């Protein structure tokens, strides 16, 4: 029980600037899909 | 990607064209199959160039052309038609009427459709910057050299 709890706490994420920098460039591209056009798709956040 | 370059109708048309080459229906294009349709169109090539025009698009090197390779050929042909003419469509978006000049009212029309709004006075600010001649209209030549309006 406590080994599982300790392992889970070690896998908890914190603020990552490298991930944050990547997202800022990603949102600046303005991607779209093929079938139609998606307006800045909101796929899963990668910072915390 | 193929979905960007090709539509559902174009994929259907290409499949019919591929099936026209593949009389057997096995799913691959051989040299004799490719040679047969060329003779129907009048050309009488030799097997030396016939193999070369297959290897030029054959990706896996198996010596035969399947539908995935056939679509990849057509996808490139549709894509490479436009190289730098993208500014022509951009010019026509501002040029509603269809002539060779961009008017202030036409610039108002596109700006009205876009999110930002103008107070009917700063529209003259950027049009005079783009229009070097001073005639009040931005032509195609003035647009490509410097784009502000
Ligand atoms: Ca065949
Ligand atoms: Ca092949
Ligand atoms: Ca015009
Ligand atoms: Ca002019």
CB-based contact A48:A15 (threshold 8 Å):
yes
- Chain A closest-CA separation from residue B117 CA (Å): 21
Q: Which residue of B has its CA nearest to A35?
A: B3
- Chain A closest-CA separation from residue B116 CA (Å): 18
CA distances from B119 to B114, B116, B122, B123, B125 (A): 14, 10, 7, 8, 11
CB-based contact B127:B107 (threshold 8 Å):
yes
B95 Cα to the center of ligand 4, angstroms: 13
SS3 string, chain B, reads CHHHHCCHHHHHHHHHHHHHHCCCCCCEECHHHHHHHHHHCCCCCCHHHHHHHHHCCCCCCCCCEEHHHHHHHHHHHHHCCCCCCHHHHHHHHHCCCCCCEECHHHHHHHHHHCCCCCCCCCHHHHHHHHCCCCCCCEEHHHHHHCCCC
CA distances from B97 to A21, B30, B53, B92, B102 (A): 44, 51, 45, 9, 9
């Amino acid at each position: 029980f406590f080994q599982s709890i300790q392992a889970l706490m070690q896998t908890c994420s914190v603020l990552d600037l490298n991930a944050f920098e990547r997202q800022n460039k990603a949102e600046g591209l303005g991607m779209v899909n093929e079938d139609g056009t998606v307006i800045n798709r909101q796929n899963g956040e990668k910072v915390m | 990607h193929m979905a960007d370059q090709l539509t559902e109708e174009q994929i259907a048309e290409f499949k019919e064209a591929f099936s026209l080459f593949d009389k057997d229906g096995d799913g691959t294009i051989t040299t004799k199959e490719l040679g047969t349709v060329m003779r129907s169109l009048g050309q009488n090539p030799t097997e030396a160039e016939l193999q070369d025009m297959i290897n030029e698009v054959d990706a896996d090197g198996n010596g035969t052309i399947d539908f995935p390779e056939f679509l990849t050929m057509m996808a490139r042909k549709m894509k490479d038609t436009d190289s730098e003419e993208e500014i022509r469509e951009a010019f026509r978006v501002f040029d509603k009427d269809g002539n060779g000049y961009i008017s202030a009212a036409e610039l108002r029309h596109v700006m009205t459709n876009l999110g930002e709004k103008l107070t009917d006075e700063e529209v003259d600010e950027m049009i005079r910057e783009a229009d070097i001649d001073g005639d009040g209209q931005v032509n195609y030549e003035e647009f490509v050299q410097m784009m502000t309006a």
